[PDB]
Amino acid sequence: DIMVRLSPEPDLARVVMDDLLAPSLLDVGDYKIVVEEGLPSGCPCTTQLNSLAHWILTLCAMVEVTRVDPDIVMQESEFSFYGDDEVVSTNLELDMVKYTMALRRYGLLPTRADKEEGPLERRQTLQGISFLRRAIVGDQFGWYGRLDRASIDRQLLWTKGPNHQNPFETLPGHAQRPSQLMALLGEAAMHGEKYYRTVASRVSKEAAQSGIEMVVPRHRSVLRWVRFGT
Amino acid sequence: PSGTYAGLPIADYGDAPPLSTKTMFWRTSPEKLPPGAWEPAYLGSKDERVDGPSLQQVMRDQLKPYSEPRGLLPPQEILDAVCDAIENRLENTLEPQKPWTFKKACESLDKNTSSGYPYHKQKSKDWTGSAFIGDLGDQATHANNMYEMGKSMRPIYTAALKDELVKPDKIYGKIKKRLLWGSDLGTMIRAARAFGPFCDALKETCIFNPIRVGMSMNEDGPFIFARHANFRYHMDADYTRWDSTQQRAILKRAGDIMVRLSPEPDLARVVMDDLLAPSLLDVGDYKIVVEEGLPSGCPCTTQLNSLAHWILTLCAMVEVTRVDPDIVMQESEFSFYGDDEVVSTNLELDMVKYTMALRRYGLLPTRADKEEGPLERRQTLQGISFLRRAIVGDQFGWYGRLDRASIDRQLLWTKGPNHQNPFETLPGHAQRPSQLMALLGEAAMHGEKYYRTVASRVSKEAAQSGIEMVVPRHRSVLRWVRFGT
Amino acid sequence: DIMVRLSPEPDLARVVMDDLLAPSLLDVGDYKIVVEEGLPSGCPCTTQLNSLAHWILTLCAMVEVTRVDPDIVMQESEFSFYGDDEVVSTNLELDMVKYTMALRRYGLLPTRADKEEGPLERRQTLQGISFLRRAIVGDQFGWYGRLDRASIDRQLLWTKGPNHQNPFETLPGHAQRPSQLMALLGEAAMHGEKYYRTVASRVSKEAAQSGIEMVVPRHRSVLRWVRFGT
Question: Changing residue 69 to A: what effect (chains A, C)?
Fold first, then answer.
């Protein structure tokens, strides 16, 4: 409803929007089945429309529970959505027992992060919450998102290439991993000297057998590049 | 199916469309061609200059020597000695490249020319000034994956007959017509990726290294030939049926070097190992198997071929002279472009033993530019030729000048659309501004008198003509060709 | 006479040239004076006109001595000229006594390039002559002009700067070092390994405590940039 009304062509956008939401047709090999429900996640718009719903579902719960009108909640809160991924920040004194119910009651399925169990927890720090799969971290210089070391490590163990049947198969030098390789250093240097140095272990070797060779940067040197850019 | 086509095994059915019964050449005057004048090659059963064998048959004729017993390998002790020397020299000269992208490889290809197996579409039919879509697109994609993955593909070469001007005999005597191998786009881009960096390296050291592929006769000529002149003895060595007489064993030796100087060697090994594996050739009705000789389709091959050449020659010299190939190669300047060679050297070379060596390898030199041998060598660099140009010893330096008789032709014939009868006149041509110029400058270097008779012909060839152009003065244009830019 | 003939405004050149050659006025401070002879050497074209005379003078003797038509000698000879700077190569059998005598008669003062004495010797080897204070050298790859040891030694020991009265003074961290300092790196490669190491360091020494850091490429890696390219 919202996106159509907000589009330069409401008359036309409506016909298209009705089409998406109409009980959907999903080709699953042997058949095309009718999917009446959930989200039809094909199209371009989709992920925006998806987040838009998430906005609508979070707000409803907050208003249902706190009983403050939705403009005041929203002037008292900072929201972050991306499809299903979400941070919800508010000064309002929200009942977490009462909240989770409303959510579940709408048929949603919230879990206590990857810590298991509730009611959902609230905290008075932002540290620890994450978003787009990076850790939300704050220091003397401001806030930033930091892809965690476990997550960094895998990227060292796997590289993308053409479709094949055995995952343990190794490529050649693969002469197009300098872009990706650089980021890894950046990501690492935000975990202090100890770590970055042992990521300086691997990013070194896997640079020998590759298309070109450059020298590995200094920590403080790359951390700056990483934090304030560019 | 099975199992013998012109001396060679059958492996499968062919998919090659039929041979061109047509020429691209067209006459410039209706005037009756001079006596003994070159003409486009024979065009089969519909050709009207003669009734002769099928093109099918002509091609069988061309395939005879691929089945011939191969010649012998150079002595093992001399073979490695050289090969290790050649690579070290490249290593001391070649600027290391950065790997060729699909993007780059897809760009390199001569877009005006058949796709090969299996669509057989001219490449332009499917390109976007950008990348291959549709048919070739898919073909181009698949091969690229097989590259990065270091997995293998079987080249499928298509066979053709070169449309060119030939000595009239080769129409009215024993009909001959030269064989070409069309590569398939898969092998094409694949080899382009694998071996493009190397060829580029070669390009940008073609004056310092004997492999002159990519050179400019005009810009680079005066200094390549200047290096040659720095040596006492010079020799034509003129080879018959180079590509057919080749030994894969040596093609593998040049393959090894090439692969050794490639950015992604492991990826390159495969491509080579394929290129060199017994070649499948698509000759119309049947695909057959060519185990020996040089498979000529893809990029690379010409540098590959010269590189082999380099080896063979360097072998004979070490074989005969008894000298370490480093010294030979430092008492000598070479020039190879495919089979076209010129060898300049300070070492007294026993011409009898030397020729013998080459023949023993299963090569076929004829006599320099006369009849019968022992091969011979001169004290002077004039008289030798290369890339169809006579090397000239001028006060302003050395150069390449296209011979009189070669000019007469380029004035007698013009390239156009494909037609049935070479003798028709191309109704009021347009495209000559560049080509006319060059031949006017070619004739420039043959003196003031020759230039006049040319100028006039140029002009009535500028009669019914697209651009009403000036004949510049001789002095002026002679300045223009020699010195540049 | 030649320069004018072969210039697009001959009429007007005739003047400037007739001007440029007329008994010349030279301000030495106390007085301007008249110099009627020798080269008047301030003008853009100056060095070409002077080269042009060197040619004329070289041929004049050569032709006198061999007694062959000057254009013939020019097709049995190759010449390089740069003001007073020459290399004369030839297939003509040339009498070194009479040649020396012929020039010293034109009033020239040649000498034996490396042993300071005439008649001028003539060797069978292009190696050991210099041109533009680089020495002619030939290896298995071809010929090249190389700058010698002492000159490259001198180029490290000193550097340009603004005007000053005492030359042992040292300015701060000279920033226009790199673009040159690299070339020095180049020109020493051509003396091979041992020496190149000797320079490789002296280069490190400075450039670090100057602009940024220097990459000191491997000896064989410069040789290729230096000899071949690019």
Answer: Complete loss of oligomerization of RdRp in the presence of VPg and RNA. Decreased interaction of VPg with RdRp. No production of infectious particles
CB-nearest to A172 from B98, B145, B266 is B266
- In whole angstroms, give the CA distance from residue C114 to residue C128: 9
C14/C20 Cα distance (integer angstroms): 10
From residue A210, how far is each of A181, A226, B86, C127 by CA, in Å? 11, 24, 26, 43
Show me where chain A is broken: residue before each gap, C-N > 2.5 A.
none
CA A111 to chain centre: 17
Say yes or no for a CB contact (<8 Å) between B264 and A175: yes
DSSP string, A65-104: HH---HHHHHHSEEEEEETTEEEEEESS---HHHHHHHHH
Which domain does C95 fall in, by range? Answer: 42-128
Residues C151 and C65 in one domain: no
| Residue A222 token pair | 């790359």
Residue type, B225: F
How near does any CA of chain B get to the CA of A175, in Å? Answer: 7
Task: Give kind and range of the element (H or E) at residue B456.
Answer: helix B448-460
Are the Cβ atoms of B330 and C71 closer than 8 angstroms?
A: no
**Shortest CB distance from B329 goes to which of C140, C225, C230?**
C140
CA distance to B216, B227, B236, per residue, from B485 (Å):
11, 21, 29
Does the distance separating the beta carbons of B326 and C224 come in below 8 Å? no
Q: Which residues of chain C neighbour B324 with C-beta distances below 8 Å?
A: none
Euclidean distance between CA atoms B354 and B351, whole angstroms: 5
Q: Are residues B331 and B429 in the same domain?
A: no
Which residue reads 């009108």 in tokens? A69
C130 is in an annotated binding site: yes
Write the CB contacts of C179 (distance below 8 Å, at least 6 apart in sequence).
none
C116/C118 Cα distance (integer angstroms): 7
* H or E element at residue B416: strand B413-419
Same domain, C159 and C227: yes
Ranges assigned E (strand) in B257-309: 279-282, 286-290
The answer to whether the Cβ–Cβ distance between A211 and B267 falls below 8 Å is no
Q: Which two tokens stand for residue B67?
A: 């089945």
Q: What is the CATH number of the domain that holds A74?
A: 3.30.70.270
Contacts of residue B326 in chain C, CB cutoff 8 Å?
Answer: 140
